[PDB]
Design a protein around this nucleic acid. Sequence first.
DNA 1: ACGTTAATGACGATTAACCG
DNA 2: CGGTTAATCGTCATTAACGT
Lengths: 192, 192
Amino acid sequence: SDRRFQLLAAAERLFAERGFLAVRLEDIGAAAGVSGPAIYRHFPNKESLLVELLVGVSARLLAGARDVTTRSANLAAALDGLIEFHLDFALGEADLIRIQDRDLAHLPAVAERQVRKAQRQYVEVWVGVLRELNPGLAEADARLMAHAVFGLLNSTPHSMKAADSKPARTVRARAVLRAMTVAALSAADRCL
Amino acid sequence: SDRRFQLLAAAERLFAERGFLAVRLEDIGAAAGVSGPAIYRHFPNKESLLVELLVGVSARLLAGARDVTTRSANLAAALDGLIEFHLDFALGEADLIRIQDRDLAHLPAVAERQVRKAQRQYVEVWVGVLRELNPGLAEADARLMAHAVFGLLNSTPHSMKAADSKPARTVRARAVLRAMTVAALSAADRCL
DNA sequence: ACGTTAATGACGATTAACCG
DNA sequence: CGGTTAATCGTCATTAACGT
């Protein structure tokens, strides 16, 4: 199915730009070629597109984070790897980031709990690394630091709608956001 | 007495929690203690509630930022004041932050341009202070740093839904997020 | 003013009725 | 299999039509 992939990619782009509710199934159909309710030959309803997109990305993030900590010999290398991983993600899959923290509530209850579980576990991987690096760090403080870092890195979605970010933009942004993130986590640590 | 204010405060809470489109006038009426499309005796349509909320907050933020830079003797004091101001906003008016960067697209075109103007000008205030502190800093890098800081500070809206909001939580979060922000901006600066 | 309860009218997700 | 186009059917914002 290259129509199945074409619909999901159209849905991803349109949900990011316009939001879930304001996107008309016919618009997704149209953008993929064929449309109105051709969609139902691939999917059983709107919601199922959103579910595939968000269950997919939330599972990928958790698996990728675990892979990073698995391969890392030491906790400093693990943190560096998690930053790199999430930075690649934030720069590369901005649309799925924007959908995940704008449209989570529009999931069927079952799917919503599955995505919240994968997200909670992704935060816990970061919290686990930060607390092992600083045994004096309270759970609550580690969580706050983690969310703050995701916010810092996910600030290209908020400064990038459909802009350049090919040449010096990609490499420059990566350098600056990594430096900001590394310094942020060091200062949090020396206050706490 | 304050029926207009009661509707806006209900609309602010519900738009933040459920998003603009999924909120029914009747839900806002209900919560304000005034069933139904009574709303039309105060406002000419849904959209006008969203417009008042977002034109209001975007104008406030710009005015507040200008006030901070006006009163500050030195650029270090100005940056500290802008951080404090935005931190107070992020901790205190989380609902309006969430609505502004989730539901901007659902404004009438005129209102959307007014809010984007006030947002652009608010970013420019931060950019002005950062470039005067570091004349070697390019415009593009200052903007990236500004957006990164807003992202970092607006990470309590994403970790806090009507939670606490208590003594130690407010003051603790403020301390930690300020330390992260100050360190982030110092490290960005010494890379650039 | 303000509010209440019935229309009205769109719009948009499913679904039915028909082809390869 | 996928697709099509013309019904349904619910759900709202918005208006009417009536009291305050």
